CSV table of C-alpha atoms and ligand atoms in Angstrom, one decimal:
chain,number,residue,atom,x,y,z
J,27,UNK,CA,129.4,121.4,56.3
J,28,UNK,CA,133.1,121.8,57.5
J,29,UNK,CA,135.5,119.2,57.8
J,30,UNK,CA,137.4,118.8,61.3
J,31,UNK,CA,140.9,118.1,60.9
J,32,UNK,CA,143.2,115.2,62.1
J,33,UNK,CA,146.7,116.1,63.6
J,34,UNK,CA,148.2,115.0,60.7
J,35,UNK,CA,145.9,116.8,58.2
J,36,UNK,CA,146.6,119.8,60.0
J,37,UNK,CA,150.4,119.7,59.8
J,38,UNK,CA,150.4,119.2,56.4
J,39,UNK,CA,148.5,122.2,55.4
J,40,UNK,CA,150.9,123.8,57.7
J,41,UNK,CA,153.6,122.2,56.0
J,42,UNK,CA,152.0,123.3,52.5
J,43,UNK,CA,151.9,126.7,53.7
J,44,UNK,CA,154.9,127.5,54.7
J,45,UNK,CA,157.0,125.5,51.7
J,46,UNK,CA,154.8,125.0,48.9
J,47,UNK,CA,152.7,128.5,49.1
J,48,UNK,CA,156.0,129.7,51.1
J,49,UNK,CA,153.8,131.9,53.5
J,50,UNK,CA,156.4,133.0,56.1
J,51,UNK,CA,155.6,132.3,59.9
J,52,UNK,CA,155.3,136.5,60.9
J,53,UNK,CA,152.5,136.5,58.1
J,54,UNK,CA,150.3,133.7,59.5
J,55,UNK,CA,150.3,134.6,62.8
J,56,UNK,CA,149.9,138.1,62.1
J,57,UNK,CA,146.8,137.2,60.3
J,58,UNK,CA,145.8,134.1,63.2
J,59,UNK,CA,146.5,137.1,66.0
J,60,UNK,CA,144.1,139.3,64.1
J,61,UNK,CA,141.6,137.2,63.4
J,62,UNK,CA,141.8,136.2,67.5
J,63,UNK,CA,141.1,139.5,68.3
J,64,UNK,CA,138.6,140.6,66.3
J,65,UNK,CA,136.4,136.7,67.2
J,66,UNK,CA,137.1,138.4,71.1
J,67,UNK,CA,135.5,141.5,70.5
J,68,UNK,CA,132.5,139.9,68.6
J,69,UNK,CA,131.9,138.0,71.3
J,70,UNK,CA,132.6,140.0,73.8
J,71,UNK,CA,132.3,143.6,72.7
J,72,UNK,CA,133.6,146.2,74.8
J,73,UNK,CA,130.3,147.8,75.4
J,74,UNK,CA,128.7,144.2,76.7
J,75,UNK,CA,131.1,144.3,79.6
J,76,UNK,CA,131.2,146.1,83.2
J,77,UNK,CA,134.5,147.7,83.4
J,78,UNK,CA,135.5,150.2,80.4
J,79,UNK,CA,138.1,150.0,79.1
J,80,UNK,CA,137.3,145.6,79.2
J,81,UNK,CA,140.2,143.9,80.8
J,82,UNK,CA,141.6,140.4,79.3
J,83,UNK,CA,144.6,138.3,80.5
J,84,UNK,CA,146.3,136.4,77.5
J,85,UNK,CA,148.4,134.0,78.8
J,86,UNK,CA,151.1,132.5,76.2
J,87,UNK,CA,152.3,129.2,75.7
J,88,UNK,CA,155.8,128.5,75.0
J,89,UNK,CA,155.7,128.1,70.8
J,90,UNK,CA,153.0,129.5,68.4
J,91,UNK,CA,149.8,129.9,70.1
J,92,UNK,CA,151.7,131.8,72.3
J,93,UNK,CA,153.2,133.8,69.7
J,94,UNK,CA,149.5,134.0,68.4
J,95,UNK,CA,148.6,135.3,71.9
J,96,UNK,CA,151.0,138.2,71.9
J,97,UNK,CA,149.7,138.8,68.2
J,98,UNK,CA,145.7,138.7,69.7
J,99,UNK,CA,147.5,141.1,72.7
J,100,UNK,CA,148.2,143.9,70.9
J,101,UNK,CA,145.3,144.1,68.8
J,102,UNK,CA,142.9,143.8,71.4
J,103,UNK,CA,144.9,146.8,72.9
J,104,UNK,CA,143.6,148.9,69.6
J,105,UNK,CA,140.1,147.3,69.9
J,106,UNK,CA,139.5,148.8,73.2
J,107,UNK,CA,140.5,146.5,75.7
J,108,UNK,CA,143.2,146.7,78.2
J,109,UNK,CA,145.4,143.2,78.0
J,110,UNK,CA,147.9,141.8,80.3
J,111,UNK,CA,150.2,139.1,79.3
J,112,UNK,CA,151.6,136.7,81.3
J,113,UNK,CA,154.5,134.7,79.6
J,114,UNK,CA,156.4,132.4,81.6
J,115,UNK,CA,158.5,130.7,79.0
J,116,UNK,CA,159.5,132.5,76.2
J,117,UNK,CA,161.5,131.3,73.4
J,118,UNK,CA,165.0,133.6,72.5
J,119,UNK,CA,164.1,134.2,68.6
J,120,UNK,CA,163.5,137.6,67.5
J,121,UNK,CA,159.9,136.6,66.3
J,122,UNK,CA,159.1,135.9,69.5
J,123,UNK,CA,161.6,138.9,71.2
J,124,UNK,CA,159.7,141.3,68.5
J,125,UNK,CA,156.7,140.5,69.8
J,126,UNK,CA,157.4,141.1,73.4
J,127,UNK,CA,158.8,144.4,72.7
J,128,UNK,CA,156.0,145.7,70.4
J,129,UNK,CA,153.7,144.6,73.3
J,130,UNK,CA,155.9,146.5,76.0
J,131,UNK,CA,156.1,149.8,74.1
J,132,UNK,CA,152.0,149.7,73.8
J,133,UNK,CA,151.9,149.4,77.9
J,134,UNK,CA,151.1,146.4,77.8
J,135,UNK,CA,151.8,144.8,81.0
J,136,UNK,CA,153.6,141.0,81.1
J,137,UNK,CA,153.3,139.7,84.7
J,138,UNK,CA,155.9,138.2,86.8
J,139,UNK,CA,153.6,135.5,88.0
J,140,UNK,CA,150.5,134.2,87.5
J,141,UNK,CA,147.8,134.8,90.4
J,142,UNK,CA,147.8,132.1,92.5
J,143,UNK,CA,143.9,131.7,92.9
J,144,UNK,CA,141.0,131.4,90.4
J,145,UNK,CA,139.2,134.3,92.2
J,146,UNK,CA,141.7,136.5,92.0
J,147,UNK,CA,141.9,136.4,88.0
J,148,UNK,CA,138.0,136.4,87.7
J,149,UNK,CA,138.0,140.2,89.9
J,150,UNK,CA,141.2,141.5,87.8
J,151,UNK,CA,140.3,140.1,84.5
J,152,UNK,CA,137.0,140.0,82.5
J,153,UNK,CA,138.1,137.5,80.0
J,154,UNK,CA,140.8,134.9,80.1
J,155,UNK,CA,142.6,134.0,76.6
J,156,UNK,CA,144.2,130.7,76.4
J,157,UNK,CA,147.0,130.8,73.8
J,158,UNK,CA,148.8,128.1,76.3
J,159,UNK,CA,149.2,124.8,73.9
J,160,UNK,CA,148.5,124.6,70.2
J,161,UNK,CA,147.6,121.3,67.3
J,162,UNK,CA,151.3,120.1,67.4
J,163,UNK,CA,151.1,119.3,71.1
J,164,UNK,CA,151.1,115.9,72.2
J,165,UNK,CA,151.9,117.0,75.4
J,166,UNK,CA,152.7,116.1,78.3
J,167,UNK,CA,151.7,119.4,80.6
J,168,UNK,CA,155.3,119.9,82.1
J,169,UNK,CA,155.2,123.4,85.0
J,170,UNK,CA,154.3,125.7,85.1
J,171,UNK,CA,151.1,124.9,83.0
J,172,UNK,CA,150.0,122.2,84.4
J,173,UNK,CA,149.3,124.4,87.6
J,174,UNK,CA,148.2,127.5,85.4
J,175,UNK,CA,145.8,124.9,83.8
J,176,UNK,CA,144.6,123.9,87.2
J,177,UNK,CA,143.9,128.0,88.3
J,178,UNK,CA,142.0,128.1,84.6
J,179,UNK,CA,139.3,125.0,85.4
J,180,UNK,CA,138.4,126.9,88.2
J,181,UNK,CA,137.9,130.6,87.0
J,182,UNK,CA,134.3,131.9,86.8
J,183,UNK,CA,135.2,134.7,84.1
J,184,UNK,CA,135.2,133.2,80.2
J,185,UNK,CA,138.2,131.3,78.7
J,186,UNK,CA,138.8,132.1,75.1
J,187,UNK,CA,141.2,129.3,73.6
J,188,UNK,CA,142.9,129.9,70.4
J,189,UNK,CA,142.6,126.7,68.1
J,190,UNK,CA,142.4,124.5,70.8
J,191,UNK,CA,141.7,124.2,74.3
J,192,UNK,CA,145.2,124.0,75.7
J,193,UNK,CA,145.3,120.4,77.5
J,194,UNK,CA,143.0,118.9,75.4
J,195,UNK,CA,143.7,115.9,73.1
J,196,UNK,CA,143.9,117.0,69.6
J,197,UNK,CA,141.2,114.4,68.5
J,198,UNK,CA,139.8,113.1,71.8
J,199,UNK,CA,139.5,116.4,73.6
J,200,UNK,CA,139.1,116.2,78.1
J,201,UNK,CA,136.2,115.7,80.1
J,202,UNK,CA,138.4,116.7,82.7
J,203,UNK,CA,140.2,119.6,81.4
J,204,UNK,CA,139.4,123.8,80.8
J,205,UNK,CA,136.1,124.4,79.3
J,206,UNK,CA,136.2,127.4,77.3
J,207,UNK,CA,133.3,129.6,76.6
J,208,UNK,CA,134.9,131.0,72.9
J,209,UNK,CA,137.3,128.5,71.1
J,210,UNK,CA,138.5,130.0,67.9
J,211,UNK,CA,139.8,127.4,65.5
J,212,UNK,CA,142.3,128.4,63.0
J,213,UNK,CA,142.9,127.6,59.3
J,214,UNK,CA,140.0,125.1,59.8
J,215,UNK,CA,138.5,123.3,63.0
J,216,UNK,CA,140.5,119.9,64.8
J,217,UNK,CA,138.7,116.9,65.9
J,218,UNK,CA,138.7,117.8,69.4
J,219,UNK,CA,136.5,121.0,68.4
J,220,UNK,CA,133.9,118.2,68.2
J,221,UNK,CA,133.9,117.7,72.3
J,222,UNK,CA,133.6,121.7,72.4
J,223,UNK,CA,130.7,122.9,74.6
J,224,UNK,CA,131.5,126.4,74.7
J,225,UNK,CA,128.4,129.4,73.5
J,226,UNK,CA,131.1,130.3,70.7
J,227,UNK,CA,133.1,128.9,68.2
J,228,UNK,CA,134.7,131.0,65.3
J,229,UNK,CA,136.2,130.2,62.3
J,230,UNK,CA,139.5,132.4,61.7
J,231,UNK,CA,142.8,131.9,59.7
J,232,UNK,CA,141.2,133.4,56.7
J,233,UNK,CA,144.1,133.2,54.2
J,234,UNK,CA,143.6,129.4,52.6
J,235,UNK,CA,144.4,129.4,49.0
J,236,UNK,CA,141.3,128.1,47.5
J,237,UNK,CA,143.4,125.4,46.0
J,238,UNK,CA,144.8,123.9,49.3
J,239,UNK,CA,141.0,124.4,50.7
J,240,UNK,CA,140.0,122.0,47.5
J,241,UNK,CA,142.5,119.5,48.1
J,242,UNK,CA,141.8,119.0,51.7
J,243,UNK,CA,138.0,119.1,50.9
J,244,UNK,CA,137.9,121.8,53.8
J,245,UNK,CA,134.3,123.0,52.7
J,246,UNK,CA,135.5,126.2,54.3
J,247,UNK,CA,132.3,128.7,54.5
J,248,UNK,CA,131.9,132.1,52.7
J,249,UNK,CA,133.4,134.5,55.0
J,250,UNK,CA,131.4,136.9,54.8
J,251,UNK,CA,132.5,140.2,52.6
J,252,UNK,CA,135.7,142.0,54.1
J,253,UNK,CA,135.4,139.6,57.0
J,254,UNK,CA,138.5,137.5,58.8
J,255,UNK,CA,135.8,135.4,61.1
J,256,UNK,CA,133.1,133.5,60.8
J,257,UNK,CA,130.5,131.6,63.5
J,258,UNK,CA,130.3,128.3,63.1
J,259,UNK,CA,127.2,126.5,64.5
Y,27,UNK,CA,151.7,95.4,81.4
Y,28,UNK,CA,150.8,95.1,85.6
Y,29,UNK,CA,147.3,93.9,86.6
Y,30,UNK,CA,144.5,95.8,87.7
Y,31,UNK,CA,142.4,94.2,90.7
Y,32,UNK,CA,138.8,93.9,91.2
Y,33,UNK,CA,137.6,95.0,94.3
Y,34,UNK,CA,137.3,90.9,94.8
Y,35,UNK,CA,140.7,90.0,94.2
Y,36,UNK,CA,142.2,93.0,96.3
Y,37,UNK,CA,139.9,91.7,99.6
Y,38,UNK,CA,141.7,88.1,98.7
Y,39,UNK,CA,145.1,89.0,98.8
Y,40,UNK,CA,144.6,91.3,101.9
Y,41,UNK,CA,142.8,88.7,103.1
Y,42,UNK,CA,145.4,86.1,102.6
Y,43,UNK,CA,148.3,88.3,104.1
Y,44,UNK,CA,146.7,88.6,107.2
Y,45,UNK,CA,145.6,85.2,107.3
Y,46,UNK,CA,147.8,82.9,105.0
Y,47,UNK,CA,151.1,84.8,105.5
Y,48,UNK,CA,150.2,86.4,109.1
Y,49,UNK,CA,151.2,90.3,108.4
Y,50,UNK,CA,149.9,92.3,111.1
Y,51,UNK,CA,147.9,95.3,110.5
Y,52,UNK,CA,150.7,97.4,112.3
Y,53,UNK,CA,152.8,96.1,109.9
Y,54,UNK,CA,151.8,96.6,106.3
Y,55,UNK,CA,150.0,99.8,107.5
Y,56,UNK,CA,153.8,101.1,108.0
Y,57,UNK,CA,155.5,99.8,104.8
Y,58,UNK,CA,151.9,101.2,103.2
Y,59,UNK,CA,152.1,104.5,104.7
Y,60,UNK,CA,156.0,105.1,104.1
Y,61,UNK,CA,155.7,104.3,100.2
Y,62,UNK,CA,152.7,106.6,100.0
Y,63,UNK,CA,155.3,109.3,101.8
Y,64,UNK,CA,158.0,108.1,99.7
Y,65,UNK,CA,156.4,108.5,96.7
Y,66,UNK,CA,154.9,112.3,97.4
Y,67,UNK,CA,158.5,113.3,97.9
Y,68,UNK,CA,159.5,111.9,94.6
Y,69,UNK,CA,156.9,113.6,93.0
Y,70,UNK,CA,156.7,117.0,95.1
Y,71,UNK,CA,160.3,117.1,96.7
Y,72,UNK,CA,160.4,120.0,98.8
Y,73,UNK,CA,162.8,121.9,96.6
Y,74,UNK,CA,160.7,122.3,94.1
Y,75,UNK,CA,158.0,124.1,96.3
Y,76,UNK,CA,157.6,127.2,96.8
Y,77,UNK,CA,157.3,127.4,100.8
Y,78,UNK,CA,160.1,125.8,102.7
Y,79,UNK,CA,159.3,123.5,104.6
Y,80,UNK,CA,156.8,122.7,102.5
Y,81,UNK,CA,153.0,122.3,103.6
Y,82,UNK,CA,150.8,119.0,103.5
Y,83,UNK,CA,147.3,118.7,104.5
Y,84,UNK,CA,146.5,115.4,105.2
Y,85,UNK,CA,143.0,113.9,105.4
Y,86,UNK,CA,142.5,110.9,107.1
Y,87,UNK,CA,139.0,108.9,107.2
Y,88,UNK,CA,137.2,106.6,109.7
Y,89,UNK,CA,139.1,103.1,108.5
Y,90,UNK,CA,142.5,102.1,107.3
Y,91,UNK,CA,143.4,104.7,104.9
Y,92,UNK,CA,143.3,107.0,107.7
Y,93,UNK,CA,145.6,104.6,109.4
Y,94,UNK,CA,147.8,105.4,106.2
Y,95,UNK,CA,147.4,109.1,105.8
Y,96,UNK,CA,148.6,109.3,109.7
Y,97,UNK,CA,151.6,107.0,108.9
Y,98,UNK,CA,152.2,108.9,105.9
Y,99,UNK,CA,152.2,112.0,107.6
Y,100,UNK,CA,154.6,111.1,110.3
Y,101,UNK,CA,157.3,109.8,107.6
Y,102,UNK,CA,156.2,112.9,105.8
Y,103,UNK,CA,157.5,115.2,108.9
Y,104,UNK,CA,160.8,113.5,108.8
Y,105,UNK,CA,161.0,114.0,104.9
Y,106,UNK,CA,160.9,117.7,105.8
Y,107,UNK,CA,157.4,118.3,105.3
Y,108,UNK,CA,155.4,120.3,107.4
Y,109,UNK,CA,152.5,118.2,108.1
Y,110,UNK,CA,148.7,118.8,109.4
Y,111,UNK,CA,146.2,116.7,109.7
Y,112,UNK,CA,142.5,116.5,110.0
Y,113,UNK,CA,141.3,113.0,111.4
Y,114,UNK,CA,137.3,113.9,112.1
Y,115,UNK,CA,136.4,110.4,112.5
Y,116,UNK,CA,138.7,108.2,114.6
Y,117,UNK,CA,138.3,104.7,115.7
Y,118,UNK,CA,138.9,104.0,119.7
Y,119,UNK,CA,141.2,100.9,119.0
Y,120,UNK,CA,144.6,101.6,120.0
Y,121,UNK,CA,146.3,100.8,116.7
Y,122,UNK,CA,144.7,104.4,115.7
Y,123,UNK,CA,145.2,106.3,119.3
Y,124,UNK,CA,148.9,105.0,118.7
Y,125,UNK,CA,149.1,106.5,115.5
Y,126,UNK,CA,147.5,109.8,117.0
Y,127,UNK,CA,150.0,109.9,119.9
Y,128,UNK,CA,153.0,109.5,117.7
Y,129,UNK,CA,152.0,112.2,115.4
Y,130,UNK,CA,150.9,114.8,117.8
Y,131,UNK,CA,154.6,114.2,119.6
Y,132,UNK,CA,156.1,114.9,116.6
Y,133,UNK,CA,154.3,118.7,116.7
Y,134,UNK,CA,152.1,117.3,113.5
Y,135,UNK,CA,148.8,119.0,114.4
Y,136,UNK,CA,145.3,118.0,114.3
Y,137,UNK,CA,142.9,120.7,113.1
Y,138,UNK,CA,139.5,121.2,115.0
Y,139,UNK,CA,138.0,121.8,111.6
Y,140,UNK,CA,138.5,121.4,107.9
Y,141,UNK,CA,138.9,124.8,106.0
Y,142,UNK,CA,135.4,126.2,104.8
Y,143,UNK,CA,136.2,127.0,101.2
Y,144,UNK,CA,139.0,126.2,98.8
Y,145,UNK,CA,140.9,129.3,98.5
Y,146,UNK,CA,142.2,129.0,102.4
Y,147,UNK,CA,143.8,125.2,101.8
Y,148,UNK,CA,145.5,126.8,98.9
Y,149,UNK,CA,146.6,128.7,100.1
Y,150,UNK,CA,147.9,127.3,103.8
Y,151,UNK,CA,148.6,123.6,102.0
Y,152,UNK,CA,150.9,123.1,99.1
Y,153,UNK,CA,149.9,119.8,98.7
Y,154,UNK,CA,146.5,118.1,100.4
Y,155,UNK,CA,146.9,114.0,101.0
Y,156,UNK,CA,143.6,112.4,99.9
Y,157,UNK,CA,143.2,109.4,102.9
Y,158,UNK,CA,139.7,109.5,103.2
Y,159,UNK,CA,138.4,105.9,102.1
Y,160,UNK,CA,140.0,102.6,100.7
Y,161,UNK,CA,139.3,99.8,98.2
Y,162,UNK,CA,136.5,98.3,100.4
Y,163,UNK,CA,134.0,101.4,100.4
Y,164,UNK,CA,130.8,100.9,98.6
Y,165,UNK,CA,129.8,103.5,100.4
Y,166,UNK,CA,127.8,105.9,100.9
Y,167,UNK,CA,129.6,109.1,101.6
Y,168,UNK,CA,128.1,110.0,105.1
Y,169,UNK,CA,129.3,113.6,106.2
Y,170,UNK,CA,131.6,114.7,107.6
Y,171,UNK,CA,133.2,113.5,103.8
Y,172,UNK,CA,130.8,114.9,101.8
Y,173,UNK,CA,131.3,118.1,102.3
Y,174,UNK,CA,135.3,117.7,102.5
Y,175,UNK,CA,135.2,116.0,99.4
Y,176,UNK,CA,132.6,118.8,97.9
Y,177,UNK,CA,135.8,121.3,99.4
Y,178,UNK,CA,138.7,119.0,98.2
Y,179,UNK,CA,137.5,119.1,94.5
Y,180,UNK,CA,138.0,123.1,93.7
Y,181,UNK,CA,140.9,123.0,95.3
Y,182,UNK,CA,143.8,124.8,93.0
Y,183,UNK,CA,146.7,122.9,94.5
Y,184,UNK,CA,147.4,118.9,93.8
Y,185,UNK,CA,146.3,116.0,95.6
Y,186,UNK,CA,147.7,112.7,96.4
Y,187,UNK,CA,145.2,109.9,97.0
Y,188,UNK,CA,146.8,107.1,99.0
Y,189,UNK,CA,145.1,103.4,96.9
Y,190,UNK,CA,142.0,104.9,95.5
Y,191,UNK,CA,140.5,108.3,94.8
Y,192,UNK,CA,138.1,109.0,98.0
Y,193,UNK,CA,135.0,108.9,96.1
Y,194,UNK,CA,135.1,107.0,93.1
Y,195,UNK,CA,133.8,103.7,92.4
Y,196,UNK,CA,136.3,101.3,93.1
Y,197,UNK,CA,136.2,99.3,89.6
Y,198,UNK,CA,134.5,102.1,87.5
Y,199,UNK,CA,135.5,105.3,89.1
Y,200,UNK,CA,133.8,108.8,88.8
Y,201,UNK,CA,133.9,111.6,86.5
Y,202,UNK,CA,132.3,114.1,88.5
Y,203,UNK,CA,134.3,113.3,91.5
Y,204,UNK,CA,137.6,114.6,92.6
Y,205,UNK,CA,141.1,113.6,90.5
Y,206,UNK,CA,144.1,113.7,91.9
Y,207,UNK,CA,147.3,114.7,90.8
Y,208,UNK,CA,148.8,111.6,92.1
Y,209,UNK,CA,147.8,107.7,93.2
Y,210,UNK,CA,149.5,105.8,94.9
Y,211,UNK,CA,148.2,102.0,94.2
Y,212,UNK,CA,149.1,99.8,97.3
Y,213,UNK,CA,150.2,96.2,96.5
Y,214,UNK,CA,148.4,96.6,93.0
Y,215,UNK,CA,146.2,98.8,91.3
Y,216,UNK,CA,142.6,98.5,91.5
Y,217,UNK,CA,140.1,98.8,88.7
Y,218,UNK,CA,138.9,102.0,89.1
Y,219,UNK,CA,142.8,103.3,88.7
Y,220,UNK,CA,141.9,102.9,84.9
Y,221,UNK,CA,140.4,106.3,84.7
Y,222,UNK,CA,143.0,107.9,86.4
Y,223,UNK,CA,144.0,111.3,85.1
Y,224,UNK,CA,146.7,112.6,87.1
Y,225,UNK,CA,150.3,113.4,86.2
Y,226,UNK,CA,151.7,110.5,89.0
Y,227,UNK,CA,150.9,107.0,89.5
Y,228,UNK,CA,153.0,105.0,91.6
Y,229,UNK,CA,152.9,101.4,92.8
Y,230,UNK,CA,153.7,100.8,96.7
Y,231,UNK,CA,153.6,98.8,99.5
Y,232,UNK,CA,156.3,96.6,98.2
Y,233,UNK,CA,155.6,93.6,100.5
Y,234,UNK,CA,154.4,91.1,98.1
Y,235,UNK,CA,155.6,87.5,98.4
Y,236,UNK,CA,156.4,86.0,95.2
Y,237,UNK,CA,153.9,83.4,95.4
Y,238,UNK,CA,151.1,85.6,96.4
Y,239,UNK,CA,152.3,87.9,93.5
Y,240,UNK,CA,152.3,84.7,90.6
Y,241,UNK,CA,149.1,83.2,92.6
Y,242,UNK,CA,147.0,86.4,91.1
Y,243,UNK,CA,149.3,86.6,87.6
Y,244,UNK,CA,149.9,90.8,89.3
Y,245,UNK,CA,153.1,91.2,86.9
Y,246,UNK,CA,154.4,93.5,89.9
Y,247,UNK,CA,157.4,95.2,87.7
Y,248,UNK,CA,160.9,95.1,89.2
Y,249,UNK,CA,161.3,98.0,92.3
Y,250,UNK,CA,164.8,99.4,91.5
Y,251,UNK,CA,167.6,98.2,94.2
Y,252,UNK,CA,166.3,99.3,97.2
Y,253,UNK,CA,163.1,101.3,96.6
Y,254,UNK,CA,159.9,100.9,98.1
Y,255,UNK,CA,158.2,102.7,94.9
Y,256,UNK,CA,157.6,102.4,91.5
Y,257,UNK,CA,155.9,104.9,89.0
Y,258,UNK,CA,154.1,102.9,86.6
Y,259,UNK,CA,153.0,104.8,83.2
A,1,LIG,CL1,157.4,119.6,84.7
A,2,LIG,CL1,125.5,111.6,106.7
């Protein structure tokens, strides 16, 4: 059975990563956006749902689960879906810049705000993806996310967070806060995960050297053949 | 660190500065209601809202956090708010028919009826004022506050509760109830303030005699100069 990460464990197989195995940040996140995607459509396949093409708002955080929500964007514009993005804050680096623009070219729309009222994203969007607040977050929920947060709790469409529940406490989790339906954990799962009530919860990240998975104990599962997800249980 | 009162020591020292020290009701129900108004424009000043003046929604119950929520929202008017209240249940004392008469001179109106579903305070009300019950409830919520309360907790947009969150237990709380963006503790904090979740918590009602303080150890910190609030942490 899988290990569930602390905060610290996790930065340090991110620290590993990028210095020791010297994995670059564009690779990663390619690979975590991909793997996001392709956990969506498992769960919620395009077929499964009443509008065709399915519609999903991503909404991006300000650091790297945003940057892995504009990566999960544009594939799940070439799975069959038909994202919008809404990015409020978005940091001037040309990884992040890049993204944007690759989105934009695809017609992928980024909206100027973010509707004001839970109904009103459940009847535009069938799926929400919450690529708000990654691991490394500690917080505190400055605007606008504290009020986007607050529109989120109240949807009655499913959330889909990317590694964790943005809000959430790392290790402790929130009674109080969103309550996904999908939550896709990345590399491998964080405590909070434990607190996770959700009908889904994918594995994704699949690009651990065997050796870091062996000196972090990970007991990562057999993906299965050609496959970048796997369900946990 | 600041004490936190049972729901016995809080009836003693209100007890003792109507009795003991001979406050009148009048009195600490205005230094009461101004902090709570003091403290929602330090935390929501009207610049940073989107509608100018800014909307409030104030609830007031049967007892003496009504009292409050109609003193708070007459300082709240001349903080350039844009008050209404809804005051279903009002004593015929004339401490309270005072308090009416002031605010509806001021152009502060009193609804007939408490909006039906959530999305419609959103969307009139920036911010709704949570004056509903006090300390000494135990209870039971009788309607008309049932159903408000059932309203109050899908709202989207903040609330202020003014002593304790209008539901909870006083010294254990409620997770299932409503949770406020922001408390305002009057005198000191009570119990149930422990499971507070909100961004805001701020100490009022700065009318504590140094001996009453040191007679219940309250470790009240130092109000700035001349402030009648302090956000605690
Ligand atoms: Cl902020
Ligand atoms: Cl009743």
């Amino acid at each position: 059975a899988v290990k569930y990460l602390s905060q610290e464990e996790a930065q340090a197989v991110d620290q590993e990563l990028f210095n020791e195995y010297q994995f670059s940040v564009d690779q990663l996140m390619e690979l975590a956006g991909l793997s996001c995607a392709t956990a969506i459509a498992k769960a919620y396949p395009p077929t499964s749902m009443s509008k065709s093409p399915p519609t999903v708002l991503v909404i991006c955080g300000p650091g790297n689960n945003g940057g892995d929500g504009l990566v999960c964007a544009r594939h799940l514009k070439l799975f069959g879906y038909q994202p919008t993005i809404y990015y409020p804050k978005r940091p001037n680096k040309p990884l992040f810049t890049g993204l944007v623009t690759q989105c934009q070219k695809m017609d992928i729309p980024f909206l100027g705000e973010m509707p004001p009222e839970p109904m009103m994203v459940d009847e535009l969007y069938e799926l929400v993806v919450d690529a708000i607040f990654g691991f490394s977050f500690k917080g505190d929920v400055r605007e606008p996310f504290h009020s986007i947060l607050s529109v989120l709790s109240g949807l009655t469409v499913p959330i889909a967070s990317i590694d964790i529940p943005s809000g959430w406490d790392v290790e402790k989790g929130n009674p109080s806060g969103i309550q996904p339906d999908l939550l896709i954990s990345l590399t491998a799962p964080k405590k909070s995960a434990t607190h996770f009530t959700g009908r889904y919860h994918y594995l994704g990240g699949r690009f651990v050297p065997p050796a870091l998975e062996k000196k972090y104990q990970l007991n990562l599962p057999s993906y299965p053949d050609t496959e970048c997800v796997y369900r946990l249980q």
